[PDB]
A paper describes a structure:
Type A γ-aminobutyric acid receptors (GABAARs) are the principal inhibitory receptors in the brain and the target of a wide range of clinical agents, including anaesthetics, sedatives, hypnotics and antidepressants. Here, we isolate native murine GABAAR assemblies containing the widely expressed α1 subunit and elucidate their structures in complex with drugs used to treat insomnia (zolpidem (ZOL) and flurazepam) and postpartum depression (the neurosteroid allopregnanolone (APG)). Using cryo-electron microscopy (cryo-EM) analysis and single-molecule photobleaching experiments, we uncover three major structural populations in the brain: the canonical α1β2γ2 receptor containing two α1 subunits, and two assemblies containing one α1 and either an α2 or α3 subunit, in which the single α1-containing receptors feature a more compact arrangement between the transmembrane and extracellular domains.
Analysis of our purified ZOL/GABA sample by high-performance liquid chromatography and mass spectrometry confirmed the absence of neurosteroid in the buffer and lipids used for protein purification. However, the same analysis uncovered 115 ng ml−1 (362 nM) of neurosteroid in the ZOL/GABA cryo-EM sample (containing approximately 250 nM pentameric receptor), with more than 95% being APG rather than the other three possible stereoisomers. The nearly identical TMD configuration of the APG/GABA and ZOL/GABA structures supports this chemical assignment. ZOL binds to the α1*+/γ2− ECD interface in tri-heteromeric α1β2γ2 receptors at roughly the same position as DID, but engages α1-H101 via π–CH interactions rather than a hydrogen bond. In addition, its amide oxygen forms a hydrogen bond with the α1-S204 side chain, and the imidazo nitrogen forms a separate hydrogen bond with the α1-T206 side chain. As is the case for DID, ZOL forms π–π interactions with α1-Y159, α1-Y209 and γ2-Y58, as well as with γ2-F77. Binding of DID or ZOL causes only moderate conformational changes in their binding pockets.
Residue numbers in the entry:
A (entry chain D): 25 to 319, 410 to 432
B (entry chain E): 105 to 232
C (entry chain B): 6 to 308, 458 to 487
D (entry chain C): 25 to 277
E (entry chain A): 25 to 176
F (entry chain K): 1 to 105
G (entry chain J): 1 to 52, 52A, 53 to 82, 82A, 82B, 82C, 83 to 100, 100A, ...
Write the structure that this text describes.
Amino acid sequence: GDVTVILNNLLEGYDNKLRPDIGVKPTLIHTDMYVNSIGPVNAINMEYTIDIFFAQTWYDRRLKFNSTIKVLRLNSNMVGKIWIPDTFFRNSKKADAHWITTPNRMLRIWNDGRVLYTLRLTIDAECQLQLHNFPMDEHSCPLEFSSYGYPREEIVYQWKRSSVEVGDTRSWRLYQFSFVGLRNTTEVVKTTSGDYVVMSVYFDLSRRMGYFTIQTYIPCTLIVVLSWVSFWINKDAVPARTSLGITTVLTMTTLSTIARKSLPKVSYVTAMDLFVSVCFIFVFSALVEYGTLHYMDSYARIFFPTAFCLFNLVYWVS
Amino acid sequence: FVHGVTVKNRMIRLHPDGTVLYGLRITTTAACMMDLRRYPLDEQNCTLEIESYGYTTDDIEFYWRGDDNAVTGVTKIELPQFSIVDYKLITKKVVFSTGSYPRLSLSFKLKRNIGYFILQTYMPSILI
Amino acid sequence: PSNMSLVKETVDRLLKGYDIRLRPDFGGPPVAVGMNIDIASIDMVSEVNMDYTLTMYFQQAWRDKRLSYNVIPLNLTLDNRVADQLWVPDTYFLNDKKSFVHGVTVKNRMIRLHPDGTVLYGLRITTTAACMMDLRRYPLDEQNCTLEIESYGYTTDDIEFYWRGDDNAVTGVTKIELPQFSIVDYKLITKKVVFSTGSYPRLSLSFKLKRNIGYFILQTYMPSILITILSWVSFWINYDASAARVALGITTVLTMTTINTHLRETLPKIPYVKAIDMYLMGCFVFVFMALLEYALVNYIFFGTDVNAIDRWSRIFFPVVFSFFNIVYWLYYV
Amino acid sequence: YDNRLRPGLGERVTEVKTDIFVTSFGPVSDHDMEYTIDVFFRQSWKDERLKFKGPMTVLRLNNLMASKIWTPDTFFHNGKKSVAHNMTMPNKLLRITEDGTLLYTMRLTVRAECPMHLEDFPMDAHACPLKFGSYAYTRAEVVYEWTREPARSVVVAEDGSRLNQYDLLGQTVDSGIVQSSTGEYVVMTTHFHLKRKIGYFVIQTYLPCIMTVILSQVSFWLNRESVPARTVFGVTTVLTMTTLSISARNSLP
Amino acid sequence: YDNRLRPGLGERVTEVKTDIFVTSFGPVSDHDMEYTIDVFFRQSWKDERLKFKGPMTVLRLNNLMASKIWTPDTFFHNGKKSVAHNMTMPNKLLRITEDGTLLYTMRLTVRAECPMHLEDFPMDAHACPLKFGSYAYTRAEVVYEWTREPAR
Amino acid sequence: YIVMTQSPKSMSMSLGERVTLSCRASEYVGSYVSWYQQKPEQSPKLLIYGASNRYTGVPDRFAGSGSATDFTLTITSVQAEDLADYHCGQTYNYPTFGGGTKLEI
Amino acid sequence: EIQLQQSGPELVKPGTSVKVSCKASGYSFTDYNMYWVKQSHGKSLEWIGYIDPYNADTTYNREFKGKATLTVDKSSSTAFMHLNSLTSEDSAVYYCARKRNNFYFDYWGQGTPLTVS
Ligand SMILES: *[C@@H]1O[C@H](CO)[C@@H](O[C@@H]2O[C@H](CO)[C@@H](O[C@@H]3O[C@H](CO[C@H]4O[C@H](CO)[C@@H](O)[C@H](O[C@H]5O[C@H](CO)[C@@H](O)[C@H](O)[C@@H]5O)[C@@H]4O)[C@@H](O)[C@H](O[C@H]4O[C@H](CO)[C@@H](O)[C@H](O)[C@@H]4O[C@H]4O[C@H](CO)[C@@H](O)[C@H](O)[C@@H]4O)[C@@H]3O)[C@H](O)[C@H]2NC(C)=O)[C@H](O)[C@H]1NC(C)=O
Ligand SMILES: *[C@@H]1O[C@H](CO)[C@@H](O[C@@H]2O[C@H](CO)[C@@H](O[C@@H]3O[C@H](CO[C@H]4O[C@H](CO)[C@@H](O)[C@H](O)[C@@H]4O)[C@@H](O)[C@H](O[C@H]4O[C@H](CO)[C@@H](O)[C@H](O)[C@@H]4O)[C@@H]3O)[C@H](O)[C@H]2NC(C)=O)[C@H](O)[C@H]1NC(C)=O
Ligand SMILES: *[C@@H]1O[C@H](CO)[C@@H](O[C@@H]2O[C@H](CO)[C@@H](O[C@@H]3O[C@H](CO[C@H]4O[C@H](CO)[C@@H](O)[C@H](O)[C@@H]4O)[C@@H](O)[C@H](O[C@H]4O[C@H](CO)[C@@H](O)[C@H](O)[C@@H]4O)[C@@H]3O)[C@H](O)[C@H]2NC(C)=O)[C@H](O)[C@H]1NC(C)=O
Ligand SMILES: *[C@@H]1O[C@H](CO)[C@@H](O[C@@H]2O[C@H](CO)[C@@H](O[C@@H]3O[C@H](CO[C@H]4O[C@H](CO)[C@@H](O)[C@H](O)[C@@H]4O)[C@@H](O)[C@H](O[C@H]4O[C@H](CO)[C@@H](O)[C@H](O)[C@@H]4O)[C@@H]3O)[C@H](O)[C@H]2NC(C)=O)[C@H](O)[C@H]1NC(C)=O
Ligand SMILES: *[C@@H]1O[C@H](CO)[C@@H](O[C@@H]2O[C@H](CO)[C@@H](O[C@@H]3O[C@H](CO[C@H]4O[C@H](CO)[C@@H](O)[C@H](O)[C@@H]4O)[C@@H](O)[C@H](O[C@H]4O[C@H](CO)[C@@H](O)[C@H](O)[C@@H]4O)[C@@H]3O)[C@H](O)[C@H]2NC(C)=O)[C@H](O)[C@H]1NC(C)=O
Ligand SMILES: CCCCCCCC/C=C/CCCCCCCC(=O)O[C@@H](COC(=O)CCCCCCCCCCCCCCC)COP(=O)([O-])OCC[N+](C)(C)C
Ligand SMILES: CCCCCCCC/C=C/CCCCCCCC(=O)O[C@@H](COC(=O)CCCCCCCCCCCCCCC)COP(=O)([O-])OCC[N+](C)(C)C
Ligand SMILES: *[C@@H]1O[C@H](CO)[C@@H](O[C@@H]2O[C@H](CO)[C@@H](O[C@@H]3O[C@H](CO)[C@@H](O)[C@H](O)[C@@H]3O)[C@H](O)[C@H]2NC(C)=O)[C@H](O)[C@H]1NC(C)=O
Ligand SMILES: CC(=O)[C@H]1CC[C@H]2[C@@H]3CC[C@H]4C[C@H](O)CC[C@]4(C)[C@H]3CC[C@]12C
Ligand SMILES: Cc1ccc(-c2nc3ccc(C)cn3c2CC(=O)N(C)C)cc1
Ligand SMILES: *[C@@H]1O[C@H](CO)[C@@H](O)[C@H](O)[C@H]1NC(C)=O
Ligand SMILES: CCCCCCCCCCCC
Ligand SMILES: CCCCCCCCCCCC
Ligand SMILES: CCCCCCCCCCCC
Ligand SMILES: CCCCCCCCCCCC
Ligand SMILES: CCCCCCCCCCCC
Ligand SMILES: CCCCCCCCCCCC
Ligand SMILES: CCCCCCCC
Ligand SMILES: CCCCCCCC
Ligand SMILES: CCCCCCCC
Ligand SMILES: CCCCCCCC
């Protein structure tokens, strides 16, 4: 055919190991992304999964051809035959391309020398979540990538006009957060091997607390009301009062343990930890109130709900 | 493993003199036996034992290029559970029945963050 | 070293001009591929994934005129890498979920060329075969788990399967020692499964595992029986002791339902009711009826005869529970 | 033969008559909002280059010839970590008919993404999709089709259901186009309609909840003078309710 | 060189002298009745085809030459799923002595099956086996042996 | 099989006005619902394929629409050539056709 | 272009079989299935069956199962429908359609009127 001869001519005398314009000028690469879906944000492991269609285009004077054919649209077969930039993701704990049924890669070659190379990736990017206030935490999770071995003088990156072709967010597995937006940056990081141009995409995610309300906040408020109801029970009922108080505080301890299990292992008190601590204070105070009463009730009947509501207002407004 | 997206995370750079700069982005689950007798007040020491497998000291020789600048990025490591107090670079020669081989040891003296266990473990026991 | 050169020449002739893309007797009668298994172990028989991990020495023997030699009298056992240069049947396990040939030290493969042309090709395969289990009588259930060896690309017009050695093809099943199962029986079946692409040969190796009940007495049945007997203690406490009897009742009921939920959470989310579920719900009926018996006693008193109700319960609850056990165990065992 | 060019390049549009035989509809993971399905994914297409005439009309071969010739780069749009089975050999078949038609079947375990709206859980039904199409070739180069009638082109094996808490009511197929900055791509969609079986949750959460509320209402028959008994009756039931709610949320993402 | 043919094929049994150096006896997974072990699985054998004369009496090479020559198809009978570590490079050493002797060691993580009779648990002791041998070659083709005293 | 129902048995409209012909499918048919035009003593002629895709050589005034079971064929401006019997047929299952709407003046 | 020529109109007594042809010239005959549609005067189009010419694989409607037999001549590139045990209701106009793909029938036959009396 007329296309097979073009490919044979292009690959004839083609050094796959050499980048375009090596020793001449840095190779400008324009990268674009289609964020198919931001997968689950694993706050416990400080990582999140993202599925993308990563596209990168560059000019290669070796891959230029003049003929009636305008483009050479090719599958993954030709990806390994020509020079592809060694773009790796700096904050990817583990990433893998898609191979079923065939490798999910595309490669198009224009007459001038444009080489649009796209592939589908599933990156388990590392987002350094700072959950000092949880579950109201808002995170700007990045996704960096750069050439692994080619310094700034040999491979330069740049963002095409279309910033990021983010897909429809309805089908995303992002249950915890809501995708607020995207923002791109391009900075020259210095390291031991040289200076490398790094392009980073920050996805801004804002947490939703509805599941945490029905999961943690509501049970703790209900058990605090269970602590409250002890006051209306007659003071003479020593076993009843003591039983209600102990059941309340012990199940509060259990609820605190499971709520902390939801969180990762981090050494700082969070907002949920503050709320459960205040609930501890309330239930323990009710038990001690009956302890001192046996060894006043109406004052507690007012102070406990009012203190809890005022603390709720102060805590929630923050 | 070595990461392989979008391509195998590997670098080769030939310098004019002959030096071959060779880099790999590596994730290692390294074994670290922990003496948890003082846990959670424990200062664990975990090591990475770099060694040549088939080449003895008569054939290969290791060294940290830069006496202590050969290992960087340790300070920026914000480990959620531990605090990296110190780290050392050691060069030795371990002897097996097959021969003597060069060894590099990268040791981190991690320290446990007591606050998380104070809030999680110690405080419930104290209140109980 | 002369015989080494002779064998090198023979194997070089065998591999010279060998079309791996074409099966033996291509454009001819189907090649008879005999099979024989050596069950190394059966492990991880888990109902949560509805699968079982089977490690086996899977041997296939098939004639191949292209691999026939007559100069050398001995049988040539070649390095396993030669399997990559030889045609082998494209067999697969239709219910396999995750399989692998063992890696160390080398690829666990065996290739043995016989002078007549027979090829003995062996693999050490660890396969997580899918076994859809009927847990209706669990844990007193027999599970019929199968391995379905089939030729993927070659129809019955191009390949045939048979258990080489008939019932003696599969060995080592008796030596298997499952932790909670007893392999009471195993069977070998030869079928011809028809798909839209054609009719393919099939070998079904089916094990009828029988679940050991001893562990479930220790962890499942005996604790619930003891909790029911404990709930019976409330009948021996006078009706005035409201706190004691109520605490005994609610503690027993809550522990019973907690036991049921904790056990069922480990198992998959099957809709139907199991035998262990049947027993647990039956004993929950007994303990909840003990609590409601105290409730009736309290209502009848506050809202001689009440001692009559308490005494009749004191003897009828163990008797009715024993008859429930009789019916249940007779039906299920 | 050039493996890098599709059949009829520059003169035709490569029509691939795909087909699915669901060997087993694997378990549905509501936590991951995905589902597993093992299929005999068959594709068929005309390739004039692979035209022959010999003693036999159809050449049944193995995967080695499949790798040597052009095959469509079909991928699943909502696929997530699928595996092409390889034991014992690559589970693929290639069949070159003398006219040039190729029948290329592969055994796959595709873990497709099924976005579920769990608003009516557990009395909920989900239409789990499975969309597939060419990755590199636009609608002007590779077009997909159902080999049989669309209703009869996705067949599910009778004794293949591996579902525990779901019921495969049926499947419905369709064909459409995906717009992209890269181009227009033909997509074959098939929705498997699953209905969750409420049986497990009746005896796991609904029955415990009903018995707990009846247990709490038992306290209305105890005498009012017995304060500890009814107090423990209430507090133990509320604590049981909290535990039930927490243990019921973990069954879902 | 035909790496598909074992040394002395049709003339002699291939004497393989093997020894094990346990770098670390891994944790015992009594739940799965299995244990992990990390070993320098050394095995040496004579090979007349690999005789040479030169300035060095020992050719100390890498795994690439190990792939090029015949090596025994040793496998662990009770191994479940082992790992042949290959980072940074295949952790194997291959040394050819001038007389034709080969020393071929390799770092392995064998996860082997250890059937436990837990009647006296937790006050119980076990003898976890580590069996290995040729997968394809019978006793008349290759025979294994300990390079030193069996105790040592 | 799938039964196709044509709601307008016979529609009478003047020249140059919007007209919509409906089509109902008993079961799911997806986008496999074609429309055909058949003049008297003549074979059917395909106009709309898929659900809204316009067949080649068809005037732009024809427009199809429909997702699942409700399908409509709309003529923006009826011309003298647009007076014939219009059929809707489904190819999701074995082929079936509707009664056939006839356009009059 | 594509042209489907059918046999001319004919009249036959009840109980006598009849065959109707369908000749295609524009395209390669074996690539696409050939369908047969019956249309009685004033009634809806009714599908009889279709034949896959390459392997001659046939599928029939339940109503016409046994009433009609579909055959093919690849060398002549013709599709034949054979009707047997004809009755009064069998009088209708028959078309042969070419199914381009799952969506539409591309080219229809000119039409073979059938009458019985
Ligand atoms: C230590 O040992 C391990 C194994 O124990 C080695 O890891 C293996 O390395 C080999 C060689 O590099 C890999 O083979 C390659 O696999 C490519 C696709 O792999 C996918 O499928 C396999 C299953 O077969 C999965 O295991 C993979 O997933 C794992 O690997 C990826 C990284 O690749 C990780 O990110 C994952 O997390 C997993 O860990 C993948 O899902 C396959 O395409 C490739 O074959 C192409 O390239 C060769 C090069 O010679 C060509 O000959 C061949 O024809 C193919 O080329 C075609 O396709 C490319 C696709 O772009 C086109 O560009 C070409 O033009 C042409 O069309 C190769 O077979 C193997 O996957 C990997 N993992 C295993 C075996 O589990 C380590 O490398 C080794 N060393 C070190 C230092 O660790
Ligand atoms: C975590 O735990 C590891 C244990 O593995 C600690 O590593 C040890 O660290 C100590 C101190 O840094 C090392 O001790 C060293 O001993 C050397 C002598 O032995 C080696 O000698 C030559 C090199 O000269 C080698 O070829 C040979 O094979 C021996 O291995 C000294 O040379 C070292 O330097 C200094 O030693 C003394 C004082 O210690 C000075 O007077 C000398 O002048 C010299 O400058 C050093 O002392 C030890 O080898 C390490 N490995 C072990 C014990 O296995 C880590 O330190 C620990 N983590 C942290 C953070 O401390
Ligand atoms: C290369 O490999 C070949 C093939 O294995 C070897 O030749 C076979 O060696 C086996 C030894 O196990 C022979 O098997 C024995 O055959 C006896 C006669 O059986 C005849 O009828 C059967 C009917 O099916 C034929 O298959 C068979 O070929 C014979 O024609 C049997 O009486 C034996 O039965 C029992 O023997 C012992 C106990 O005595 C048991 O341990 C056995 O398990 C079995 O129950 C036995 O079956 C066989 O006859 C040989 N020829 C073949 C198979 O054609 C070569 O020896 C080998 N060369 C080497 C290693 O150098
Ligand atoms: C699914 O399962 C199938 C099983 O069929 C696997 O397919 C086999 O995979 C192996 C490993 O990749 C292939 O082995 C390869 O063989 C090539 C050809 O070997 C011959 O030719 C060379 C010279 O060209 C001779 O040296 C050799 O002795 C043979 O005569 C080799 O060229 C390959 O070499 C590669 O690996 C070696 C490993 O040591 C490297 O050193 C090389 O540099 C090179 O990278 C390799 O050995 C085998 O051919 C495949 N087919 C078959 C039929 O076995 C699939 O890999 C597996 N997975 C998938 C996804 O399909
Ligand atoms: C685990 O569960 C699987 C279920 O899939 C069981 O596999 C099936 O087992 C049954 C019984 O073994 C198979 O059914 C039939 O077995 C017959 C055995 O021969 C008996 O019957 C014949 C005829 O009645 C008698 O003449 C003879 O003396 C024996 O008494 C086969 O002969 C049958 O084949 C015949 O019938 C079929 C169907 O009509 C025909 O197609 C055949 O050509 C032939 O004429 C038949 O095979 C059944 O085939 C097995 N597979 C299935 C159902 O898929 C396992 O047995 C079970 N294992 C354990 C350990 O529990
Ligand atoms: C059909 C066969 C079925 C088979 C099942 C057999 C079921 C049968 C079992 C029925 C239960 C036995 C009690 C029946 C009598 C109760 C009534 C009573 O109070 O009687 C007397 C006391 O009661 C006793 O004498 C106590 C003897 C039983 C105590 C056993 C405890 C051992 C626990 C071991 C558990 C360890 C668990 C080990 C784990 C497995 C006196 O009553 P009274 O107050 O004086 O009133 C009468 C006077 N009046 C007449 C004037 C009113
Ligand atoms: C710890 C508790 C122990 C207690 C022991 C006591 C013993 C209790 C015994 C329990 C019976 C055990 C049943 C197991 C079988 C599973 C359920 C089932 O199959 O339902 C099926 C019917 O669908 C429904 O039933 C839903 C309707 C609601 C049922 C709940 C009503 C609550 C009554 C409120 C009243 C409150 C009281 C009012 C105030 C006084 C659904 O099953 P499926 O899977 O989806 O499949 C389809 C159906 N199929 C199976 C036929 C094909
Ligand atoms: C993603 O990255 C791209 C490239 O870095 C960002 O687009 C760039 O945005 C700047 C500022 O808006 C543009 O500069 C301005 O251009 C306008 C129009 O020509 C001109 O009037 C101004 O004076 C100024 O020069 C820049 O042109 C544009 N890049 C391109 C290629 O057009 C984009 O904003 C980033 N997306 C984010 C941050 O969400
Ligand atoms: C008179 C009497 O014996 C009393 C003793 C205990 C009482 C039951 C407790 C649980 C109640 C739950 C709901 O309120 C419905 C009624 C309900 C079943 C009650 C019926 C009447 C009983 C049996
Ligand atoms: C920057 C960029 C933009 C688009 C692509 C892309 N190329 C294809 C080819 C095929 C299919 C199905 C999807 N492709 C997508 C992703 C897309 O556009 N979707 C999901 C709507 C790649 C890179
Ligand atoms: C391609 O050919 C055209 C016409 O022959 C010519 O004008 C153009 O310069 C050529 N381009 C090359 C050789 O790169
Ligand atoms: C699990 C928490 C137990 C109670 C901890 C109380 C200590 C104070 C925590 C809040 C400090 C702001
Ligand atoms: C007692 C009421 C608790 C909830 C109060 C919520 C107040 C609204 C805060 C919204 C953010 C400013
Ligand atoms: C469908 C099976 C429902 C079984 C319900 C539990 C039966 C318990 C019987 C207790 C007898 C005292
Ligand atoms: C729900 C009330 C349960 C009462 C059980 C009583 C059992 C013994 C009855 C004897 C009557 C005299
Ligand atoms: C289980 C049903 C018991 C019915 C008892 C009726 C009691 C009526 C009130 C007068 C005596 C308490
Ligand atoms: C006192 C009797 C209580 C019930 C005894 C259990 C019977 C088990 C039968 C087992 C089947 C053989
Ligand atoms: C030390 C625990 C609280 C004790 C309070 C008792 C009443 C004064
Ligand atoms: C005597 C105190 C009455 C309490 C009023 C309600 C407070 C929530
Ligand atoms: C930063 C350390 C915080 C420790 C937890 C608060 C004290 C219980
Ligand atoms: C790391 C500082 C821990 C603070 C402990 C506070 C005890 C209430």
